[PDB]
Paper text:
The DH domain forms a six-helix bundle arranged with a kink toward one side similar to the ‘seat-back of a chaise longue’ in line with the canonical fold of DH domains. An interesting feature that is specific to the Bcr-Abl DH domain is the extended 18-residue-long loop region between α-helices 4 and 5 covering residues 622–638, which is 10–13 residues longer than in most other DH domains. To increase the crystallization probability of the DH–PH tandem domain, we generated monobodies, synthetic binding proteins based on the fibronectin type III domain that bind to the DH–PH domain29, 30. The crystal structure of the DH domain includes the six major α-helices in accordance with the NMR structure. No electron density was observed for the extended flexible α4–α5 loop region seen in the NMR structure, so this loop was not included in the crystallographic model. Overall the comparison of the DH NMR- and crystal-structures revealed an identical overall fold with some variation in helix orientations. The monobody bound, as expected, via diversified positions in the FG loop and the βC/βD strands, to the tip of the DH domain proximal to the N-terminus. Notably, these residue that are important for GTPase interaction, catalysis, and selectivity are not conserved in the Bcr-Abl DH domain. Furthermore, the extended α4–α5 loop points directly into the GTPase binding interface, where it would sterically clash with binding of a Rho GTPase. Our structural data show that with its extended α4–α5 loop blocking the DH-GTPase interface and lack of conserved catalytic residues, the Bcr-Abl DH domain may not act as a GEF. Collectively, based on our detailed study, there is no evidence that the Bcr-Abl DH domain acts as a RhoGEF.
The Bcr-Abl oncoprotein is expressed from the Philadelphia (Ph) chromosome, which is formed upon the t(9;22) reciprocal chromosomal translocation that fuses the breakpoint cluster region (BCR) gene with the Abelson tyrosine kinase (ABL1). Bcr-Abl is a constitutively active tyrosine kinase and is selectively inhibited by imatinib (Gleevec), which became a paradigm for targeted cancer therapy. Due to the different translocation breakpoints, p210 contains a predicted Dbl-homology (DH) and Pleckstrin-homology (PH) tandem domain that p190 lacks. Here we provide high-resolution structures of the DH and PH domains that unravel unique structural features.
Author numbering:
A (entry chain A): 3 to 95
B (entry chain B): 489 to 623, 638 to 688
Write the structure that this text describes.
């Protein structure tokens, strides 16, 4: 596929998550990982992950809380650098 | 979970997260421990900040907690750096669970320690300053309580990626049982 697909949480601790996705068939220049409490009790945050990876660790989370997590992919193969269809999941820690 | 090769990687990740969490916890314990030295020094002089009794009440079992978690962290770290299906970590978790008596003593005393420390921060001049820059004091005193409550959660999170064919499985399951029993008794 041309864009990241099949985002999922594959492991967890009470305050951290390992997300994983299917890497696209392009050279990814940069990933941006976005996450925040789905209900807005704390702000949305972002961090960067190298394009050679297809997993990311999110730490410092609150236990027993709903989070929304989104992966953005930047590639010089993409018309406007960022891919046309970022992928999101919800997860309760 | 059914792919044992993926499970091996997931188990390493959980153990890496436990290491990072222990690092953070050990730093908070150290933050509590550091003012004990000058406090105990001044207590035996004619210008004490807190009496020895107040020190023993507030800081009860903090050195002991530090020792058992330092033992656990130092034992676990090299095993994660040499990771394979052959690696076994279960005895470390059993050993920590065997030491839950330290936590029982700490939790039993927490309310008294919390009150004693809140009094002095509201009234004592030098100790309120100490509790203001702890590498607050009352925030750190809750760390052992908040954490042991999550002990069965982390053990379950590790067992989720440990197959029944691996000899760590019965050890981790037993540590979880003992930890569940401890939480039930509290």
């Amino acid at each position: 596929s041309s864009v990241p697909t099949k985002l999922e949480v594959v492991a967890a601790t009470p305050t951290s998550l390992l997300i994983s996705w299917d890497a696209p068939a392009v050279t990814v220049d940069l990933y941006v990982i976005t996450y925040g409490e789905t209900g807005g009790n704390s702000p949305v945050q972002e961090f960067e992950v190298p394009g050679s990876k297809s997993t990311a660790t999110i730490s410092g989370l609150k236990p027993g809380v709903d989070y929304t997590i989104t992966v953005y992919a930047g590639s010089y193969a993409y018309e406007y650098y960022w891919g046309p269809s970022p992928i999101s999941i919800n997860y309760r820690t | 979970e059914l792919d044992l090769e993926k499970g091996l990687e997931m188990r390493k990740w959980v153990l890496s997260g436990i290491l990072a969490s222990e690092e953070t916890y050990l730093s908070h314990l150290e933050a509590l421990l550091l003012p004990m030295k000058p406090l105990k020094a001044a207590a035996t002089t004619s210008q004490p900040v807190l009496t020895s009794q107040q020190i023993e009440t507030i800081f009860f079992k903090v050195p002991e907690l530090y020792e058992i978690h330092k033992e656990f962290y130092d034992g676990l770290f090299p095993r994660v750096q040499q990771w394979s299906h052959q690696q076994r970590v279960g005895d470390l978790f059993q050993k920590l669970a065997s030491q839950l008596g330290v936590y029982r003593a700490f939790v039993d005393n927490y309310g008294v320690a919390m009150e004693m420390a809140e009094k002095c921060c509201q009234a004592n001049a030098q100790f309120a300053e100490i509790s203001e820059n702890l590498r607050s004091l009352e925030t750190l005193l809750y760390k052992p309580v908040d954490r042991v409550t999550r002990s069965t959660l982390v053990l379950h999170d590790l067992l989720k990626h440990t197959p029944a064919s691996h000899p760590d499985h019965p050890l981790l399951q037993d540590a979880l049982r003992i930890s569940q029993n401890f939480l039930s008794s509290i």
